[model samples]
Target chain A: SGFRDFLLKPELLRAIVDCGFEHPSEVQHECIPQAILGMDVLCQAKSGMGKTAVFVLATLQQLEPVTGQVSVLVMCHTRELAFQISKEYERFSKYMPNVKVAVFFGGLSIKKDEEVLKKNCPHIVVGTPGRILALARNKSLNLKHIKHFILDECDKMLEQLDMRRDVQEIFRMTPHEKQVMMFSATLSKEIRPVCRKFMQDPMEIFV
Target chain B: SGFRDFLLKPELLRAIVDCGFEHPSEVQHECIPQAILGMDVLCQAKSGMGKTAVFVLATLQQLEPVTGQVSVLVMCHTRELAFQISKEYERFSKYMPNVKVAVFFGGLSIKKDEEVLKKNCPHIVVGTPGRILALARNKSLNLKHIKHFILDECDKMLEQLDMRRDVQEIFRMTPHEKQVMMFSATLSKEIRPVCRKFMQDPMEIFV
Candidate 1:
C-alpha cells in the first residue's frame, strides 16, 4: 500500500528516530495508518495514550504538496498543549523546510497579533475556544482550506455550559466537508449529543 | 514497519478523501511518528505544507492527562495569526476533553485575559512576541513547566530591531532547557545568529 510506502522512507524514519522514538506505541501503530489515509476519528483514549499523534498523522497525511490559504485548525483545551502542538509540528516537519506555523490564544496582546498577520500568515493554527470565537467574530480569523479540524479535550470544551455557545460558533465556521476528529478522555451525555450533531460517523478508538 | 503507517482511520480517511488527498503529503508523511514519541523538534516548513497539523498533533500527544497550568508558549507575528492560531487549536482539540487554551496577545482587554487565566491556566499557549513577552516580564505569565516553546513565523516576528530585544527578554524569562522550535518561511542573515544561538541544532526541514 502507498501508506506502507511512506513508512519505508528512510529519511522520514530517521527523522522520527532523531526525535527519540523507538517504536510506534499501540495508538500510533493503529491510528497512524488510519489517520494518514484520511479518517474522521473519535478516540476514547486517555490523556496519555497517543490520541494526539493519531490526528497529527491523519492531518499530515491529508495535506497536499501545494500550500493553501486556510490550513489546519486545532482548538485545544489548554495553553501548554497549544505550545506542545506547535513544537511537535516543528519536529515532524523537520524534513520540510518551507512550512510556516502560527499559534494564538489569550494571555498576550491582540493588537500585536494583528501585526503578526500583516507580517506573515501561517498555514496551520492552534488555540482555544473563547479567543478563537472572538477573533472569528472580528473577521480577523479565516477558516478557508482547513482540511483537518481537531478538538482536543472535546468533552470539557463542549459539555461546559459556558463553552457551548462559543463551541457552536466555531463549529459553524469550519468547512462543512472538513475532517473532524474528536479525542476525549471520557464521553458525557452532553458531549455525545454534540458529537452526533457535528461529526460524521467517526470511528471510535477508546483506550 | 511503523514508517508506512501514515493513513488515517476509516472515518478520518473518508474526510481526507473528501478533501481530495490521494496520498500522505510530505510533511505529514515525515512528522507524525516523531511527534507521537514526545520528542522535541525544530521545523522550517513554509506555509501550506501542513506544519500547523504537526503542532496541534504534538500538543495533543505531549500533554498530561488532566488540565494543568499554562505549560506552552506560542509566539506569532501578527494579530490575525494569533487569532487564527487560537481558532485552529480549537478545531483540532474539539474531540479531546477538558483541556484549557488561551491567547496572550494585545487588541482586546488585558483584564479579560487575566480573568481567564485567573479562572484556570491554559495547557497550551499561542500569541505574538511583543504581547506575550510583556506578560512574561509583568510576572503575569508563569512558565514553570513549559517544556515547549515555539517561535512561529520567527523571522517575520523579528523584523524590527526592537523586536529582537523583546524576544531576548522572553528567552530570559523561560527555563534554560525548554525545547525550542522555530518555523519560518526563510531565515534572514541578520537573524540567523540569534537563531543559531538560541536554537540547538534544530532540524531544518525544507518542503
Candidate 2:
C-alpha cells in the first residue's frame, strides 16, 4: 500500500529504510511506479526534492537482473552533480555489492576510465556531458546495450549550449528501445519540445 | 510521535530521513536517547546492528552547539573503522557545514595532520589507536576540552595487545569529566571491571 507497493528490490527497500525516508515525495510518489514499469518519465521538481533518488531506485531495481552489461546511463551537465548521482547509486545499492557503478567527469584521467570500463564493467555509468562524450568517442564506454537513459537537471543542461549539443549526440548513440527519463526544476517550453523528441509518450509530471 | 520524541536536530533528522530509516533499530531506540543527554553509555550490540548510527546521531545531536575546539572524540581499533566512523559523521552532518571533523590514522603523513589540526581546528575527532596517540603526544591534538570520549568495537580493541596499550594511553590523555561510551558485540568479564573504571554510572544496555 506504500513504498512496498512499488515492488522495488528487497535490498533497495532495506537501504531506503536505512536512509530514513518515511514516505515518497510527491514526485517520487508519481514517478517511481511509472518509472519502474519502464515508462519514459518527464518530471519537473525543484532542487533537493528527492528527484535523484527517483531515477536511482528505478534504474537500480530494473538493472539488478540485467548483469555483465552497462544497462543504465545517467548524465548531467556538471561534475559535482554527476558525482552526487553516483554517491546516491552507491548508497541505494550498498547491500548489493554485485551492482557495479562507474562515474566519469573532467580532470580525471581517461586512462583510468579505460581500465575501469574494461575491468570493472559496471552496470551503471554516471557522468558529465563532455567526458561522457569523450569516452564514447574513445570507444571505452559503449551505450548500445543501455536499458535506461536518464538526463538529470535537464533545465540546467539545456541552458548550456555545448552540453545541450553533447546530450543530443549522446542520445543518438543509444538505441531507441531504452527508456528516457528527463528530470528538471522548470520544464520550460523553451526545451520541453526539444527534450520530448527523445522520448515516446513520456509520463509528464510537474511537482 | 516516534523519532520526534528523540528531539534530534532538524538538519540531522533531514539527513536521517534522506537516508531512508522510518524508525530506529532496537539498539538505536535505546542508546540514542541516553547518549544525546550526555550520559556515559555501555552497550552490547553485534556488527551490522545499527550501532554506528546510534553513536553518530547522538554525538552529532549533542555536539551541534559545541564549537571551535575538539569537544568530541571517537577512538576505534583499526584505520578502516576510523574512516567509516568519519564517513558516518559526514553523512549525519551533511547539512551542518559549520561542524568540523578531523580523522587520524597510520600511513597518512603526520605533517598533513599537523596542518589540518592547526588550520581546520576540528570540533570532533575520529581516529585509530596508534596515530591518534601519536598526534596526542605530538600535541597537534589536545583532549583537555573534550566532552565525549567513545570507544567503538571494544571487543576487537581489547584482543590486540598493542591497540589495548595504545587505547589505555589515549584514555589517560583526556580529562576525567568527559563522557565515555563503550560499544561492542560482547563485553566479556575479562574487561568489564577494567573498562567500567573509565566511566561513571554509564547507562548500560545489552541489546
Candidate 3:
C-alpha cells in the first residue's frame, strides 16, 4: 500500500512498484488527487520534482484503456520532452497493456502522423503545441472526446508568439466538460491569465 | 516462411507478422542477409524504401538481449528519425521481449541521459549524432562495446561541417570490430570519401 494513499487500481499500482517508487513525491502527493477529482490543475514545481508523473498517473488512472481513440492529450514544447512524456505513460501503463500512447511533434511527414493515428489509435497523445494544433484544426486528430488535456511546461508553451494561439485553439477544439491541467517549473505573469481562459477554476499548487 | 528466407529467429518472424508484412520488401530482401552475415554495408535507396528495417531486423536477430549494456547504436541526423527508428525496434522486439531500446536527442537535462543509461541498459541506442557525440565525449555513453553502428541518413550527416566531425568522432569511439552500415537517400560526392574512411570494404548496393 505504498501508493495506497491514492487508492490507485491494482494494475497502476503494479507499474508504480515496477518503477521502484515506494511512495509519491511531495508535488505528486498534492496535485494528483485534486486532478483526479476533476479539478483543473495549475502546478508549478521545480525540475526533478516528479511533476510529469503527477499528470501521467492521474490521467492514466482515470482512463478506460480503450484503444484506437485518444482519451488523454498531453502537449509540451520540445520534441524531446514530448517523447519523454510519452515514455512516462508507456512505463506506467506497462501493467495496463491496452492503454497506448502516440507522441507527435515537428519534422515528420503528415502521412506518418496519420499512419499511427489510424493504426494504433492510442489512448494518450503527447506532442508539441504547433503540431497538436494542426492535427486538431485539420481534423487528423479528434479532440472531441478527450477526457483530460494537459499542457506540460506551460510557461514555455505560452511564451511563444505563435504557440499561445495554437494552445488556445487546441483547447477550443476539446470538449468543454473535460479536465485540464498545466505544469511548469516557472509560472510567468502571462501564464496565469492564459490559464483562466482554458480552465473554469484551477487548483494552483507550487511545491 | 515469409521472412523465413533469411532464417530469422521465430520471435522476429512473429514481429514481421505483427506488422502484417507477408513478404520482405525489395530492399529488405536484398540487405537483410548480407548484414546478418557480418558485413559492412553502404546502401542507397529512396525514401519509404523500408531501409530502416534492414538494420533493425538484422541487429535484433543477432543481439544477445543482454541487459544493462549497449551492443547496437543507430544514429540519425534529426530527432524525429531517431524516435521513429526506436519505435521500429520496439515493434519488432515485441516478440523477443528481452531486447531493449533507448533513444537520445537534444533537450532535457544531461542527467536525464545518465539516468536512463544506468537504468535501462538498452541493447539498441537510436539517437541524433550531435547528442550521441556529446554523450560519447562526456563519457556518459560508452561506445567501446557497440557492435553495430549505423548512420541513418549518411548524406545529411556528412553535409554539415560540425556534424561530419561529430559522426567521425562517434565512429572512432565505437569498437573497431563492429558492423558499420551507411544508409542515405542520395549519396553525395563527399559522402563516398567519408564512408570509405569508416567502413572496411563495404558491400555497396543500390535498390
Candidate 4:
C-alpha cells in the first residue's frame, strides 16, 4: 500500500496521490512502519534526506484526534525550520483530520500564541527548541498530552547548542515510558550522552 | 532566476533539491532577495514558512568567513530552539566551508555559557530571548561585531514572550544603525506602537 493507505482522511489520501509519491522515500518506507508501532527510534541519514517527513508521519499515526492541549512536540532549531516542520505536520495531517497542530516560536506575538494555546492546545506543537523549551519551562505549554516526541536533526542540535541541560529538563518533566524518536545526519560524541540519557534502549535505524 | 541560482555549492544545492523544493518558499523567496542586498526587513509570515533560512542565508552571504569573535546574534525563544537554530545555521553554512555558530540559553550553568562566550566569540550566536537579554543586560554577551540583527517569528515572540522588557534592555545595549530584520506572522495593532518605537523606517514584507 502507498502512503495514502496510512492517511486517516479519505481526502488526504487523494491529496497524497496528487503529490505523486508512488512509494515512500527510503527513510519514510523504513521508519514509518516501525514508528507506527510506538517504538523508540534513532534514525540516521544524510542531509536532504526526508528525515523530517519520516518522524512527522510516525508522529501523525500516534496522535489521537481529540484536542485540549499539546499532544506532540517537534522541536527544531530555527523558527524557519519550526515552520517547515509545522507545515509538514499539517500536510501529513491532511490524512488525520482530527488532529490539530500549532506553531510555537519566539520573535512573534505572545498574545497570538496564547490564544491558540488556549483554544486548541494542538495535537502537534512544532517550533524551535528554545521557544518550545521556554513554553515548557513557563508551564504555558503542556507536555502531559504528548505521547510522542521527535527530536529531529540531533547531531545538528548538539553541534554547538547548550542543549543537554534543557533536554534533560524536558525529559525530567515528561513521562519516561512515552515514545521518543531522534533523527540525525551523524551522531557526534556530544550527542551520545543525550541519546543514552533520554532514550530507553531505542532501536537504531540507519538509512 | 530561481533562488537556487544563488547557491554556490553542490552539497547545499543537493540539500535543497532533496527537500523537493524547486523554488524558494514564501519567506525565503521574498525576504532573502532583499536581505542579500543588506536591507533591514520587517518580515511577517504565518508559522512554518521558512523565515529562519532567510536570515541564515543572508548572514552567510554578508559576513566574512571569520574564526574569531561572534559575528551573529540569533536571540530565539527557548533553549531547545536556540540549539536547533544554531545547528541549522551551521548546516546551511557548511556550504560556505568555514563558519561557526554558538548557542546561549537559560536553565544551565551560567558559568559555562559565559566561559564559551568569553573564550570563543562565535561568528553566529543563536539563543532564546531571556538568556540573551540577560547576558546583554549583564554586559556578558557582546554585540560589538554584530552587523545583522534578526528576530524570527516576531509576532508570536512579542505576543507570547514575557521578556519584552528584557528584550528591550538587550536591544538598548546594541549600537544604533545595526541592520534589523523583524519577522512575524501578524503585525497586530498591539505591537504597532512598540514596532514604531524600535524599528527604523523598516522595510516591511507580508505574505
TM-score against native, each model: 0.48, 0.58, 0.54, 0.49
Tell me the docking grade of candidate 2: incorrect
Q: For every candidate, give the share of true A-B contacts it also has.
A: 0.00, 0.00, 0.00, 0.00
Per-residue alpha-carbon lDDT of candidate 2 for residues A86-193, written as tens digits (9 for 90 to 100): 767766764464676778876878888888888768889988888888888888888888889998888788778888899989888988898899988888878887
User: Per-residue alpha-carbon lDDT of model 1 for B103-174, expressed as tens digits?
Assistant: 777877666766766666688878867777666666667766676777777777667778877887777777
lDDT tens readout by residue for model 4, B1-207:
455776434545533443335667767876776777777787767767777777877777778645566666767654555554664564454333345577776779777778877776667877778878767666677766677777765665666657676667667767785677776667887875565566777667776
| Per-residue lDDT over A1-207 for candidate 3, one digit per residue giving the tens place of the 0 to 100 score | 557778788778856764557777788888888877888899899988888999999998888755567889998876767766876776676445456678788688767887778766788888888788777777889888898989888888888868888888888888889998999888877667876678877888876
Poorest lDDT segment (10 consecutive residues) of candidate 3 chain A: A91-100
Pick the winner on TM-score between candidates 1 and 2.
Answer: 2
lDDT of 4 by residue, A50-162 (tens): 88877776676566656466667776565567667766765655434335566665645565556556643566777666667777777777777678877776766655547
For model 3, report the TM-score of its A chain. Answer: 0.95
Best by TM-score: 2
Residue B41 CA displacement from its true place in model 2, Å = 11
Give the whole-model CA lDDT for all candidates, comma-separated.
0.65, 0.80, 0.80, 0.67
Q: Label model 3 with its docking quality class.
A: incorrect
Is model 1 an incorrect, acceptable, medium or high docking prediction?
incorrect
Q: What fraction of the genuine interface contacts, i.e. the true contacts, does candidate 4 reproduce?
A: 0.00
